[PDB]
Design an enzyme around this catalytic site. Structure first.
Site, PDB file in Angstrom:
ATOM      1  N   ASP A 138     -41.769 -14.369  58.229  1.00  0.00           N
ATOM      2  CA  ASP A 138     -42.626 -15.669  59.012  1.00  0.00           C
ATOM      3  C   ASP A 138     -42.012 -16.383  60.050  1.00  0.00           C
ATOM      4  O   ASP A 138     -42.318 -17.567  60.084  1.00  0.00           O
ATOM      5  CB  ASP A 138     -42.632 -16.659  57.613  1.00  0.00           C
TER       6      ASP A 138
ATOM      7  N   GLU B 172     -24.287 -14.077  49.596  1.00  0.00           N
ATOM      8  CA  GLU B 172     -25.351 -14.495  50.818  1.00  0.00           C
ATOM      9  C   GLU B 172     -24.901 -14.094  52.267  1.00  0.00           C
ATOM     10  O   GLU B 172     -25.771 -13.463  53.031  1.00  0.00           O
ATOM     11  CB  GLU B 172     -25.696 -15.631  50.876  1.00  0.00           C
TER      12      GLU B 172
ATOM     13  N   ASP C 203     -32.279 -17.102  59.048  1.00  0.00           N
ATOM     14  CA  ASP C 203     -31.316 -17.385  58.120  1.00  0.00           C
ATOM     15  C   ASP C 203     -29.947 -17.099  58.772  1.00  0.00           C
ATOM     16  O   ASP C 203     -29.909 -16.185  59.346  1.00  0.00           O
ATOM     17  CB  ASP C 203     -31.329 -16.429  56.850  1.00  0.00           C
TER      18      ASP C 203
ATOM     19  N   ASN D  78     -36.647 -13.283  58.066  1.00  0.00           N
ATOM     20  CA  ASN D  78     -37.378 -12.847  56.857  1.00  0.00           C
ATOM     21  C   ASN D  78     -38.933 -12.326  57.484  1.00  0.00           C
ATOM     22  O   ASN D  78     -39.135 -12.629  58.925  1.00  0.00           O
ATOM     23  CB  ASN D  78     -36.794 -14.147  55.887  1.00  0.00           C
TER      24      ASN D  78
ATOM     25  N   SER E 208     -39.038 -17.495  60.920  1.00  0.00           N
ATOM     26  CA  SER E 208     -37.993 -17.855  60.087  1.00  0.00           C
ATOM     27  C   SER E 208     -36.421 -17.043  60.075  1.00  0.00           C
ATOM     28  O   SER E 208     -36.857 -15.626  59.867  1.00  0.00           O
ATOM     29  CB  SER E 208     -38.147 -18.375  58.789  1.00  0.00           C
TER      30      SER E 208
ATOM     31  N   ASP F  60     -31.887 -31.985  47.118  1.00  0.00           N
ATOM     32  CA  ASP F  60     -33.101 -32.365  47.540  1.00  0.00           C
ATOM     33  C   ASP F  60     -33.867 -32.074  46.380  1.00  0.00           C
ATOM     34  O   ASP F  60     -34.498 -32.876  45.906  1.00  0.00           O
ATOM     35  CB  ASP F  60     -33.761 -31.710  48.738  1.00  0.00           C
TER      36      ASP F  60
ATOM     37  N   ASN G  90     -32.103 -21.621  56.126  1.00  0.00           N
ATOM     38  CA  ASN G  90     -33.148 -21.260  56.960  1.00  0.00           C
ATOM     39  C   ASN G  90     -33.535 -22.270  58.074  1.00  0.00           C
ATOM     40  O   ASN G  90     -33.379 -23.126  58.021  1.00  0.00           O
ATOM     41  CB  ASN G  90     -34.288 -21.093  55.977  1.00  0.00           C
TER      42      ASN G  90
END
Length: 129
Positions: free
Chosen positions: A48, A35, A52, A46, A50, A101, A59
């Site tokens: 939208d 990663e 990272d 990415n 958004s 989660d 994110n």
């Protein structure tokens, strides 16, 4: 900061990772390689808004806020940027809500494709832990 595989590994130890929610250290170290590349600065956008951040690509639509991604709901209540500094506290303490989660480490598009189901122990081998 780029961590070293071995040095990464102890680090994340150091921090509650190993076992945690029943992922192995290894899970965490190959994860966080593919990663991030051992590099905690690395950022990733990415299509939208958004983006990272950090070793463990968190994110900014849900985990941390960064002041340009409008969907934002700032679920580890930490700014992005925190993410990228050369102590993992953050991340790992952030990582800790993503991984509990619902989805485990599947919530990580990369573990899943490249680490899920391989012998992640071969990451930690040679490590003093």
């Amino acid at each position: 900061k780029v961590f070293g595989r071995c040095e990464l590994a102890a680090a994340m130890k150091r921090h509650g990772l190993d076992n945690y929610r029943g992922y192995s250290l290894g899970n965490w170290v190959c994860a966080a390689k593919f990663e991030s590349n051992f590099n905690t600065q690395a950022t990733n956008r990415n299509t939208d808004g958004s983006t990272d951040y950090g070793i463990l690509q968190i994110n900014s639509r849900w985990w941390c806020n960064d002041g340009r991604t409008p969907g934002s709901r700032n679920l580890c209540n930490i700014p992005c940027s925190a993410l990228l500094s050369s102590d993992i506290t953050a991340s790992v303490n952030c990582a800790k809500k993503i991984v509990s989660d619902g989805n485990g480490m599947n919530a990580w598009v990369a573990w899943r494709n490249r680490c899920k189901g391989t012998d992640v122990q071969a990451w930690i081998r040679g490590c003093r832990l």
